[PDB]
Amino acid sequence: DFSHVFKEFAARGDWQRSLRLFKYMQRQIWCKPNEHIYTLMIGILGREGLLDKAFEIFDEMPSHSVARTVFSYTAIINAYGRNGQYGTSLQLLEKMKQEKIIPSILTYNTVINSCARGGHEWEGLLSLFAEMRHEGIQPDLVTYNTLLSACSSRGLGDEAEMVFRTMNEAGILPDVTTYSYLVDTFGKLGKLEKVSELLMEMEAGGTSPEVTSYNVLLEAYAHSGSMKEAMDVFRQMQTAGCVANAETYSVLLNLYGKNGRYDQVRDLFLEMKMSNTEPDADTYNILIQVFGEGGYFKEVVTLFHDMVEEKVEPNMETYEGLIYACGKG
């Protein structure tokens, strides 16, 4: 019941009441706090940024005859990493190793994440992974997603290629998360064909590729000047079949504005429109801008009749362009 109350207080952020209850139970013989209550209090203190109080509570454990477990070490490592203290996490890992405490897969993953977020060299992450492998750590799906990122965090071109291939070459791939992060890394270096691959890899895996996923790659794909590739990616996203908010179309259309087929614009509109994905305040503004640059001002007026019927409300930029349109006409 004490642990349940502590968890409920940590869910609401009542660190003060939890600390008071812990300090009161510490003086009670019938309610002596155990290692679980100490870990819960340390986590509650770390969630609020009370590193000093958490450290004091962790140090008072031996005076209270409370057992210490890798759990507390992993919690301290995560608390240090959340503030960018990668060196402190490495020192805590070394101290735990000196204390004959066998590190776990979760502790190694937390240390790798802390090193990645703190700006440590990719060589350090590779050495940490090699050490974890030499001490027989166990792979996990969540760890694998964060591991695909490890190379991406480094940002090296070779690392970016390895980040993506890590899943493909060994033959084990997370359906969505690994593909997204690897695609992100592939992009800065330049996913030359890695872009087609990233969607293909996620899609035929046995899980249909995510729409948001299709879009994130797609948006950069536009930055890439990928147009036929992105169009193909759009027909490909169309192949994906994942339900998509009109926002995914919106982004691509905006690039297509420079393309200005102007009937390409027309066609896409009908389909997203009848697909229960009414154009967004954003999409309407984009459409007005795209049409306006290439004329069709009468059409611009028409969009006003249309927006009103839809009942989606206008916005500052929205009203604005509409007036520019009327001026030219």
Short mmCIF file of N, CA and C in Angstrom, two decimals, residues 78-253:
data_model
loop_
_atom_site.label_atom_id
_atom_site.label_comp_id
_atom_site.label_asym_id
_atom_site.label_seq_id
_atom_site.Cartn_x
_atom_site.Cartn_y
_atom_site.Cartn_z
N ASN A 78 20.45 7.27 -15.32
CA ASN A 78 19.44 7.93 -16.15
C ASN A 78 19.22 9.37 -15.72
N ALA A 79 19.20 9.61 -14.40
CA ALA A 79 19.04 10.97 -13.90
C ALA A 79 20.20 11.86 -14.33
N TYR A 80 21.42 11.31 -14.29
CA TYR A 80 22.59 12.07 -14.73
C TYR A 80 22.55 12.32 -16.23
N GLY A 81 22.13 11.32 -17.01
CA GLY A 81 22.09 11.48 -18.45
C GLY A 81 21.01 12.45 -18.91
N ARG A 82 19.90 12.52 -18.18
CA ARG A 82 18.83 13.44 -18.54
C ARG A 82 19.26 14.90 -18.48
N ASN A 83 20.31 15.21 -17.72
CA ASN A 83 20.83 16.57 -17.61
C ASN A 83 22.10 16.77 -18.43
N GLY A 84 22.44 15.82 -19.30
CA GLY A 84 23.62 15.93 -20.14
C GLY A 84 24.92 15.54 -19.48
N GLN A 85 24.87 14.92 -18.30
CA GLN A 85 26.09 14.52 -17.58
C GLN A 85 26.50 13.10 -18.00
N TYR A 86 27.08 13.02 -19.19
CA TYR A 86 27.56 11.73 -19.70
C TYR A 86 28.77 11.25 -18.92
N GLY A 87 29.67 12.17 -18.56
CA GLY A 87 30.83 11.78 -17.76
C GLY A 87 30.44 11.25 -16.39
N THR A 88 29.42 11.86 -15.77
CA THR A 88 28.94 11.35 -14.49
C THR A 88 28.32 9.97 -14.63
N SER A 89 27.59 9.73 -15.72
CA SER A 89 27.03 8.41 -15.96
C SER A 89 28.13 7.37 -16.17
N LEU A 90 29.19 7.74 -16.90
CA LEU A 90 30.30 6.82 -17.10
C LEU A 90 31.01 6.53 -15.78
N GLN A 91 31.20 7.56 -14.95
CA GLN A 91 31.81 7.35 -13.64
C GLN A 91 30.95 6.46 -12.76
N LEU A 92 29.63 6.64 -12.81
CA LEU A 92 28.74 5.79 -12.01
C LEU A 92 28.77 4.35 -12.50
N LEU A 93 28.84 4.15 -13.82
CA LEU A 93 28.95 2.80 -14.37
C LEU A 93 30.26 2.15 -13.94
N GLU A 94 31.36 2.91 -13.97
CA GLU A 94 32.65 2.37 -13.53
C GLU A 94 32.62 2.03 -12.05
N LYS A 95 31.96 2.87 -11.24
CA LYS A 95 31.86 2.59 -9.81
C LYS A 95 31.02 1.35 -9.55
N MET A 96 29.93 1.18 -10.29
CA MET A 96 29.10 -0.01 -10.15
C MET A 96 29.88 -1.26 -10.56
N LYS A 97 30.68 -1.15 -11.62
CA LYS A 97 31.52 -2.28 -12.03
C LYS A 97 32.56 -2.60 -10.97
N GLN A 98 33.12 -1.58 -10.33
CA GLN A 98 34.08 -1.81 -9.25
C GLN A 98 33.39 -2.43 -8.04
N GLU A 99 32.13 -2.09 -7.81
CA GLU A 99 31.36 -2.61 -6.68
C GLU A 99 30.83 -4.02 -6.92
N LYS A 100 31.33 -4.72 -7.94
CA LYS A 100 30.91 -6.08 -8.27
C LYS A 100 29.42 -6.16 -8.60
N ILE A 101 28.87 -5.08 -9.15
CA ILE A 101 27.47 -5.04 -9.56
C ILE A 101 27.42 -5.26 -11.07
N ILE A 102 26.82 -6.37 -11.49
CA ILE A 102 26.73 -6.72 -12.90
C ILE A 102 25.75 -5.78 -13.59
N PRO A 103 26.19 -4.98 -14.56
CA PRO A 103 25.26 -4.08 -15.25
C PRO A 103 24.29 -4.85 -16.12
N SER A 104 23.12 -4.26 -16.34
CA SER A 104 22.07 -4.87 -17.13
C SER A 104 21.99 -4.22 -18.51
N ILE A 105 21.15 -4.80 -19.37
CA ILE A 105 20.94 -4.25 -20.71
C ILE A 105 20.35 -2.85 -20.63
N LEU A 106 19.44 -2.63 -19.67
CA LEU A 106 18.84 -1.32 -19.51
C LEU A 106 19.87 -0.28 -19.09
N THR A 107 20.77 -0.64 -18.18
CA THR A 107 21.81 0.29 -17.75
C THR A 107 22.75 0.64 -18.89
N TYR A 108 23.12 -0.36 -19.70
CA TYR A 108 23.98 -0.11 -20.85
C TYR A 108 23.29 0.78 -21.87
N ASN A 109 22.00 0.53 -22.12
CA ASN A 109 21.25 1.37 -23.05
C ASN A 109 21.15 2.80 -22.54
N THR A 110 20.92 2.97 -21.24
CA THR A 110 20.84 4.31 -20.66
C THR A 110 22.19 5.03 -20.76
N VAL A 111 23.29 4.30 -20.53
CA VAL A 111 24.61 4.91 -20.64
C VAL A 111 24.89 5.31 -22.08
N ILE A 112 24.51 4.46 -23.04
CA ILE A 112 24.72 4.79 -24.45
C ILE A 112 23.90 6.01 -24.84
N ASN A 113 22.65 6.08 -24.37
CA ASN A 113 21.81 7.23 -24.67
C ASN A 113 22.37 8.51 -24.05
N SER A 114 22.88 8.41 -22.82
CA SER A 114 23.48 9.57 -22.17
C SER A 114 24.72 10.04 -22.92
N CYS A 115 25.55 9.10 -23.37
CA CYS A 115 26.74 9.47 -24.14
C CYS A 115 26.36 10.10 -25.47
N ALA A 116 25.31 9.59 -26.12
CA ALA A 116 24.87 10.16 -27.39
C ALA A 116 24.33 11.57 -27.19
N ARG A 117 23.51 11.77 -26.16
CA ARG A 117 22.91 13.09 -25.93
C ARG A 117 23.95 14.10 -25.45
N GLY A 118 24.96 13.66 -24.71
CA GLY A 118 25.97 14.56 -24.19
C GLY A 118 27.01 15.00 -25.19
N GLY A 119 27.00 14.43 -26.40
CA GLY A 119 27.97 14.81 -27.41
C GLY A 119 29.25 14.01 -27.40
N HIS A 120 29.24 12.80 -26.84
CA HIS A 120 30.44 11.98 -26.83
C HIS A 120 30.77 11.49 -28.23
N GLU A 121 32.05 11.19 -28.46
CA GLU A 121 32.49 10.71 -29.76
C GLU A 121 31.84 9.37 -30.09
N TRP A 122 31.69 9.11 -31.39
CA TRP A 122 31.13 7.84 -31.83
C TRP A 122 32.03 6.67 -31.44
N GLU A 123 33.34 6.91 -31.34
CA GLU A 123 34.25 5.87 -30.90
C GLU A 123 33.93 5.42 -29.48
N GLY A 124 33.53 6.36 -28.62
CA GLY A 124 33.14 6.00 -27.27
C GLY A 124 31.91 5.11 -27.24
N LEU A 125 30.91 5.43 -28.07
CA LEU A 125 29.71 4.59 -28.14
C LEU A 125 30.04 3.22 -28.71
N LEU A 126 30.92 3.15 -29.70
CA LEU A 126 31.33 1.85 -30.24
C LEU A 126 32.07 1.03 -29.20
N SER A 127 32.93 1.67 -28.41
CA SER A 127 33.64 0.96 -27.35
C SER A 127 32.68 0.48 -26.27
N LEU A 128 31.69 1.30 -25.93
CA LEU A 128 30.69 0.89 -24.95
C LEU A 128 29.88 -0.30 -25.45
N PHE A 129 29.50 -0.28 -26.73
CA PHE A 129 28.77 -1.41 -27.31
C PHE A 129 29.62 -2.67 -27.33
N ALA A 130 30.91 -2.53 -27.67
CA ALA A 130 31.80 -3.69 -27.68
C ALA A 130 31.99 -4.25 -26.28
N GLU A 131 32.09 -3.37 -25.27
CA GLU A 131 32.21 -3.84 -23.89
C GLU A 131 30.95 -4.55 -23.44
N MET A 132 29.78 -3.99 -23.78
CA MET A 132 28.52 -4.64 -23.44
C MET A 132 28.40 -6.01 -24.10
N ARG A 133 28.86 -6.12 -25.35
CA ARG A 133 28.81 -7.40 -26.05
C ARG A 133 29.80 -8.40 -25.45
N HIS A 134 30.95 -7.91 -24.99
CA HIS A 134 31.94 -8.81 -24.40
C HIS A 134 31.49 -9.32 -23.04
N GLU A 135 30.63 -8.56 -22.36
CA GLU A 135 30.09 -8.99 -21.08
C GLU A 135 28.71 -9.62 -21.26
N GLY A 136 28.41 -10.09 -22.47
CA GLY A 136 27.14 -10.76 -22.72
C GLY A 136 25.82 -10.05 -22.47
N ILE A 137 25.70 -8.79 -22.87
CA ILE A 137 24.43 -8.07 -22.72
C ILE A 137 23.37 -8.65 -23.65
N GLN A 138 22.10 -8.43 -23.32
CA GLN A 138 21.02 -9.01 -24.13
C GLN A 138 20.29 -7.96 -24.95
N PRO A 139 20.16 -8.20 -26.26
CA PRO A 139 19.48 -7.24 -27.13
C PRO A 139 17.98 -7.14 -26.87
N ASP A 140 17.42 -5.94 -26.98
CA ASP A 140 15.99 -5.75 -26.79
C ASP A 140 15.48 -4.90 -27.94
N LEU A 141 14.19 -5.02 -28.27
CA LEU A 141 13.64 -4.27 -29.39
C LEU A 141 13.72 -2.77 -29.14
N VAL A 142 13.40 -2.34 -27.93
CA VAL A 142 13.50 -0.92 -27.59
C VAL A 142 14.95 -0.48 -27.67
N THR A 143 15.86 -1.32 -27.18
CA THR A 143 17.28 -1.00 -27.23
C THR A 143 17.74 -0.90 -28.67
N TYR A 144 17.24 -1.79 -29.53
CA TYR A 144 17.63 -1.78 -30.94
C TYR A 144 17.23 -0.49 -31.64
N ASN A 145 16.05 0.03 -31.33
CA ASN A 145 15.63 1.30 -31.91
C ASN A 145 16.59 2.40 -31.50
N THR A 146 16.93 2.45 -30.21
CA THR A 146 17.85 3.46 -29.71
C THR A 146 19.26 3.20 -30.22
N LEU A 147 19.54 1.95 -30.57
CA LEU A 147 20.87 1.59 -31.08
C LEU A 147 21.01 2.03 -32.52
N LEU A 148 19.92 1.93 -33.28
CA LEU A 148 19.97 2.40 -34.64
C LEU A 148 20.28 3.88 -34.57
N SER A 149 19.67 4.57 -33.62
CA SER A 149 19.98 5.99 -33.44
C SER A 149 21.44 6.23 -33.06
N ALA A 150 22.03 5.37 -32.22
CA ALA A 150 23.41 5.61 -31.76
C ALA A 150 24.32 6.13 -32.86
N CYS A 151 24.38 5.41 -33.98
CA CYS A 151 25.20 5.84 -35.12
C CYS A 151 24.68 7.16 -35.70
N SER A 152 23.37 7.33 -35.75
CA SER A 152 22.78 8.57 -36.24
C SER A 152 23.19 9.76 -35.39
N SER A 153 23.25 9.56 -34.08
CA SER A 153 23.63 10.63 -33.17
C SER A 153 25.04 11.10 -33.48
N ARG A 154 25.92 10.17 -33.82
CA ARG A 154 27.28 10.54 -34.19
C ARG A 154 27.26 11.43 -35.42
N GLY A 155 26.43 11.11 -36.40
CA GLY A 155 26.31 11.95 -37.58
C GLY A 155 27.37 11.75 -38.65
N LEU A 156 28.27 10.79 -38.45
CA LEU A 156 29.27 10.49 -39.46
C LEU A 156 28.58 9.84 -40.65
N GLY A 157 29.08 10.08 -41.86
CA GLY A 157 28.47 9.50 -43.04
C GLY A 157 28.54 7.99 -43.00
N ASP A 158 29.68 7.44 -42.60
CA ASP A 158 29.81 6.00 -42.47
C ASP A 158 28.87 5.48 -41.39
N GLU A 159 28.78 6.21 -40.29
CA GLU A 159 27.89 5.82 -39.20
C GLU A 159 26.44 5.85 -39.66
N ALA A 160 26.07 6.85 -40.44
CA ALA A 160 24.70 6.97 -40.92
C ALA A 160 24.35 5.77 -41.79
N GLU A 161 25.27 5.35 -42.65
CA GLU A 161 25.04 4.17 -43.47
C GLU A 161 24.91 2.93 -42.59
N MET A 162 25.75 2.83 -41.56
CA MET A 162 25.70 1.68 -40.67
C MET A 162 24.43 1.68 -39.84
N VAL A 163 23.98 2.86 -39.42
CA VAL A 163 22.76 2.96 -38.65
C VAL A 163 21.59 2.31 -39.37
N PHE A 164 21.43 2.62 -40.66
CA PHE A 164 20.37 2.00 -41.46
C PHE A 164 20.57 0.53 -41.72
N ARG A 165 21.80 0.15 -42.06
CA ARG A 165 22.09 -1.23 -42.38
C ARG A 165 22.13 -2.09 -41.15
N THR A 166 22.17 -1.48 -39.97
CA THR A 166 22.30 -2.30 -38.80
C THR A 166 21.11 -3.21 -38.74
N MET A 167 19.93 -2.65 -38.96
CA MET A 167 18.75 -3.49 -39.02
C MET A 167 18.69 -4.41 -40.25
N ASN A 168 18.95 -3.87 -41.45
CA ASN A 168 18.84 -4.67 -42.68
C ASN A 168 19.84 -5.78 -42.86
N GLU A 169 21.11 -5.49 -42.61
CA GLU A 169 22.16 -6.49 -42.83
C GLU A 169 22.14 -7.68 -41.89
N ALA A 170 21.87 -7.43 -40.61
CA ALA A 170 21.77 -8.52 -39.64
C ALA A 170 20.43 -9.21 -39.82
N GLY A 171 19.51 -8.57 -40.53
CA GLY A 171 18.21 -9.17 -40.80
C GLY A 171 17.13 -9.00 -39.75
N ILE A 172 17.42 -8.27 -38.67
CA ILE A 172 16.39 -8.01 -37.68
C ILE A 172 16.08 -6.52 -37.65
N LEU A 173 14.84 -6.15 -37.96
CA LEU A 173 14.48 -4.73 -38.02
C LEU A 173 13.21 -4.37 -37.28
N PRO A 174 13.25 -3.28 -36.50
CA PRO A 174 11.98 -2.85 -35.90
C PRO A 174 11.10 -2.32 -37.02
N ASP A 175 9.80 -2.55 -36.96
CA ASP A 175 8.94 -2.15 -38.07
C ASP A 175 8.90 -0.65 -38.35
N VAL A 176 8.80 0.17 -37.31
CA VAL A 176 8.66 1.61 -37.54
C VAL A 176 9.76 2.50 -36.98
N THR A 177 10.09 2.34 -35.70
CA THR A 177 11.06 3.24 -35.07
C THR A 177 12.47 3.19 -35.65
N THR A 178 12.98 1.99 -35.92
CA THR A 178 14.32 1.86 -36.47
C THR A 178 14.39 2.51 -37.83
N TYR A 179 13.36 2.30 -38.65
CA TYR A 179 13.35 2.86 -39.99
C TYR A 179 13.36 4.38 -39.98
N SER A 180 12.60 4.99 -39.07
CA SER A 180 12.50 6.44 -39.04
C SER A 180 13.82 7.11 -38.66
N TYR A 181 14.43 6.66 -37.57
CA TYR A 181 15.69 7.24 -37.11
C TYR A 181 16.82 7.03 -38.11
N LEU A 182 16.90 5.84 -38.68
CA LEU A 182 17.93 5.54 -39.67
C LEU A 182 17.72 6.40 -40.89
N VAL A 183 16.47 6.59 -41.28
CA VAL A 183 16.17 7.42 -42.43
C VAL A 183 16.64 8.84 -42.12
N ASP A 184 16.44 9.28 -40.88
CA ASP A 184 16.85 10.63 -40.51
C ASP A 184 18.36 10.78 -40.64
N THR A 185 19.09 9.79 -40.15
CA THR A 185 20.55 9.83 -40.27
C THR A 185 20.96 9.73 -41.73
N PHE A 186 20.26 8.90 -42.49
CA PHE A 186 20.61 8.70 -43.88
C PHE A 186 20.48 10.03 -44.59
N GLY A 187 19.46 10.80 -44.23
CA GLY A 187 19.24 12.07 -44.90
C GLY A 187 20.32 13.15 -44.81
N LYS A 188 20.91 13.38 -43.64
CA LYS A 188 21.90 14.46 -43.52
C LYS A 188 23.11 14.17 -44.38
N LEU A 189 23.60 12.94 -44.32
CA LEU A 189 24.69 12.53 -45.18
C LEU A 189 24.20 12.51 -46.62
N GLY A 190 22.97 12.05 -46.82
CA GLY A 190 22.42 11.90 -48.16
C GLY A 190 22.04 10.45 -48.42
N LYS A 191 20.75 10.12 -48.31
CA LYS A 191 20.28 8.75 -48.54
C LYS A 191 20.03 8.69 -50.01
N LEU A 192 21.04 8.35 -50.79
CA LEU A 192 20.89 8.45 -52.22
C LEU A 192 19.81 7.59 -52.74
N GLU A 193 19.77 6.36 -52.30
CA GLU A 193 18.68 5.51 -52.69
C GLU A 193 18.17 5.07 -51.38
N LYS A 194 18.77 5.58 -50.33
CA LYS A 194 18.39 5.08 -49.05
C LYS A 194 17.01 5.57 -48.79
N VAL A 195 16.64 6.65 -49.45
CA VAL A 195 15.25 7.11 -49.31
C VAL A 195 14.17 6.11 -49.80
N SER A 196 14.35 5.51 -50.98
CA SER A 196 13.39 4.51 -51.48
C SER A 196 13.43 3.36 -50.55
N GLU A 197 14.63 3.03 -50.15
CA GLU A 197 14.81 1.89 -49.31
C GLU A 197 14.14 2.05 -48.00
N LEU A 198 14.20 3.23 -47.42
CA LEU A 198 13.66 3.33 -46.08
C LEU A 198 12.17 3.00 -46.04
N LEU A 199 11.39 3.52 -46.99
CA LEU A 199 9.97 3.17 -47.05
C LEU A 199 9.74 1.70 -47.37
N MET A 200 10.52 1.16 -48.30
CA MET A 200 10.36 -0.21 -48.70
C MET A 200 10.65 -1.09 -47.53
N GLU A 201 11.70 -0.75 -46.79
CA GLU A 201 12.10 -1.60 -45.68
C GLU A 201 11.03 -1.68 -44.62
N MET A 202 10.47 -0.54 -44.26
CA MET A 202 9.36 -0.57 -43.32
C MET A 202 8.09 -1.22 -43.88
N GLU A 203 7.71 -0.90 -45.12
CA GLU A 203 6.43 -1.39 -45.69
C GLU A 203 6.21 -2.88 -45.97
N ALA A 204 7.18 -3.55 -46.55
CA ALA A 204 6.97 -4.95 -46.93
C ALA A 204 7.44 -5.82 -45.81
N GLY A 205 7.84 -5.20 -44.71
CA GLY A 205 8.33 -5.94 -43.57
C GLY A 205 7.26 -6.84 -42.99
N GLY A 206 6.00 -6.47 -43.16
CA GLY A 206 4.92 -7.23 -42.57
C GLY A 206 4.09 -6.21 -41.85
N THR A 207 4.60 -5.00 -41.78
CA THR A 207 3.83 -3.94 -41.19
C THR A 207 3.74 -2.88 -42.27
N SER A 208 2.54 -2.37 -42.52
CA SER A 208 2.39 -1.29 -43.49
C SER A 208 3.12 -0.05 -43.01
N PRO A 209 3.78 0.66 -43.93
CA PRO A 209 4.56 1.83 -43.50
C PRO A 209 3.66 2.91 -42.93
N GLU A 210 4.10 3.57 -41.86
CA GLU A 210 3.29 4.61 -41.23
C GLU A 210 3.14 5.86 -42.09
N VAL A 211 2.02 6.55 -41.94
CA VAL A 211 1.80 7.75 -42.73
C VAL A 211 2.74 8.86 -42.28
N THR A 212 2.78 9.14 -40.98
CA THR A 212 3.68 10.15 -40.45
C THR A 212 5.08 9.82 -40.90
N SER A 213 5.42 8.53 -40.90
CA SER A 213 6.74 8.13 -41.33
C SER A 213 6.91 8.49 -42.77
N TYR A 214 5.88 8.23 -43.57
CA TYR A 214 6.03 8.47 -44.99
C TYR A 214 6.27 9.95 -45.15
N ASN A 215 5.53 10.76 -44.40
CA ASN A 215 5.67 12.22 -44.48
C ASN A 215 7.02 12.81 -44.04
N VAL A 216 7.62 12.30 -42.97
CA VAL A 216 8.86 12.90 -42.48
C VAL A 216 9.93 12.73 -43.51
N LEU A 217 10.00 11.54 -44.08
CA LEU A 217 10.94 11.33 -45.13
C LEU A 217 10.52 12.17 -46.30
N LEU A 218 9.22 12.22 -46.56
CA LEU A 218 8.75 12.93 -47.73
C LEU A 218 9.09 14.41 -47.69
N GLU A 219 8.97 15.03 -46.52
CA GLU A 219 9.25 16.47 -46.40
C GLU A 219 10.71 16.79 -46.68
N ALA A 220 11.61 16.00 -46.13
CA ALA A 220 13.00 16.19 -46.43
C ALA A 220 13.15 15.84 -47.87
N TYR A 221 12.36 14.91 -48.37
CA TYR A 221 12.54 14.48 -49.74
C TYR A 221 12.31 15.71 -50.58
N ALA A 222 11.36 16.54 -50.21
CA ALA A 222 11.15 17.79 -50.94
C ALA A 222 12.37 18.70 -50.84
N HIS A 223 13.00 18.77 -49.68
CA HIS A 223 14.17 19.61 -49.50
C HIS A 223 15.17 19.08 -50.44
N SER A 224 15.18 17.78 -50.60
CA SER A 224 16.17 17.17 -51.44
C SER A 224 16.01 17.61 -52.87
N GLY A 225 14.85 18.13 -53.25
CA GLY A 225 14.64 18.46 -54.64
C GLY A 225 14.20 17.16 -55.24
N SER A 226 13.81 16.23 -54.38
CA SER A 226 13.28 14.99 -54.89
C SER A 226 11.85 15.33 -55.24
N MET A 227 11.53 15.22 -56.52
CA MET A 227 10.20 15.54 -56.98
C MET A 227 9.62 14.35 -57.65
N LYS A 228 10.29 13.86 -58.66
CA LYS A 228 9.83 12.64 -59.26
C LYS A 228 9.96 11.59 -58.19
N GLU A 229 11.06 11.62 -57.43
CA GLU A 229 11.26 10.66 -56.33
C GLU A 229 10.25 10.83 -55.25
N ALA A 230 9.99 12.05 -54.88
CA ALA A 230 8.94 12.29 -53.93
C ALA A 230 7.55 12.00 -54.52
N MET A 231 7.32 12.28 -55.81
CA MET A 231 6.04 11.96 -56.44
C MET A 231 5.88 10.50 -56.45
N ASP A 232 6.96 9.82 -56.79
CA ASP A 232 6.94 8.41 -56.76
C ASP A 232 6.73 8.03 -55.32
N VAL A 233 7.37 8.73 -54.39
CA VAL A 233 7.19 8.47 -52.96
C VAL A 233 5.76 8.76 -52.59
N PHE A 234 5.14 9.78 -53.17
CA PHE A 234 3.70 10.04 -52.94
C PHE A 234 2.79 8.96 -53.51
N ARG A 235 3.07 8.49 -54.72
CA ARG A 235 2.32 7.37 -55.26
C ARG A 235 2.67 6.20 -54.35
N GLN A 236 3.93 6.11 -53.89
CA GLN A 236 4.36 5.06 -52.94
C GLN A 236 3.72 5.17 -51.59
N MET A 237 3.57 6.38 -51.09
CA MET A 237 2.85 6.55 -49.86
C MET A 237 1.44 6.13 -50.16
N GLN A 238 0.96 6.43 -51.37
CA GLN A 238 -0.38 6.02 -51.76
C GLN A 238 -0.43 4.52 -51.75
N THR A 239 0.64 3.88 -52.20
CA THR A 239 0.70 2.43 -52.13
C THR A 239 0.63 2.00 -50.68
N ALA A 240 1.34 2.70 -49.79
CA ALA A 240 1.39 2.27 -48.39
C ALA A 240 0.01 1.96 -47.85
N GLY A 241 -0.96 2.83 -48.14
CA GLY A 241 -2.33 2.57 -47.73
C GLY A 241 -2.64 2.94 -46.30
N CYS A 242 -1.66 3.50 -45.59
CA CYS A 242 -1.92 3.95 -44.23
C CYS A 242 -2.85 5.15 -44.31
N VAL A 243 -3.77 5.26 -43.36
CA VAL A 243 -4.68 6.40 -43.35
C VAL A 243 -3.83 7.64 -43.17
N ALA A 244 -4.06 8.65 -44.00
CA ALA A 244 -3.23 9.84 -43.94
C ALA A 244 -4.02 11.13 -43.81
N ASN A 245 -3.61 12.00 -42.89
CA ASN A 245 -4.26 13.29 -42.77
C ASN A 245 -3.88 14.10 -44.00
N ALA A 246 -4.77 14.99 -44.43
CA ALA A 246 -4.49 15.83 -45.59
C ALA A 246 -3.16 16.55 -45.44
N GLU A 247 -2.63 16.60 -44.22
CA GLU A 247 -1.37 17.31 -43.98
C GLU A 247 -0.21 16.73 -44.79
N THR A 248 -0.18 15.41 -44.95
CA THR A 248 0.87 14.80 -45.76
C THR A 248 0.79 15.30 -47.20
N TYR A 249 -0.41 15.40 -47.74
CA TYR A 249 -0.57 15.92 -49.10
C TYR A 249 -0.19 17.38 -49.11
N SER A 250 -0.69 18.14 -48.15
CA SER A 250 -0.36 19.53 -48.03
C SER A 250 1.12 19.79 -48.19
N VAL A 251 1.95 19.02 -47.52
CA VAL A 251 3.37 19.34 -47.58
C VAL A 251 3.92 19.16 -48.97
N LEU A 252 3.56 18.06 -49.59
CA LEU A 252 4.05 17.80 -50.92
C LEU A 252 3.54 18.82 -51.91
N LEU A 253 2.29 19.21 -51.77
CA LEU A 253 1.68 20.15 -52.70
C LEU A 253 2.41 21.43 -52.66
#
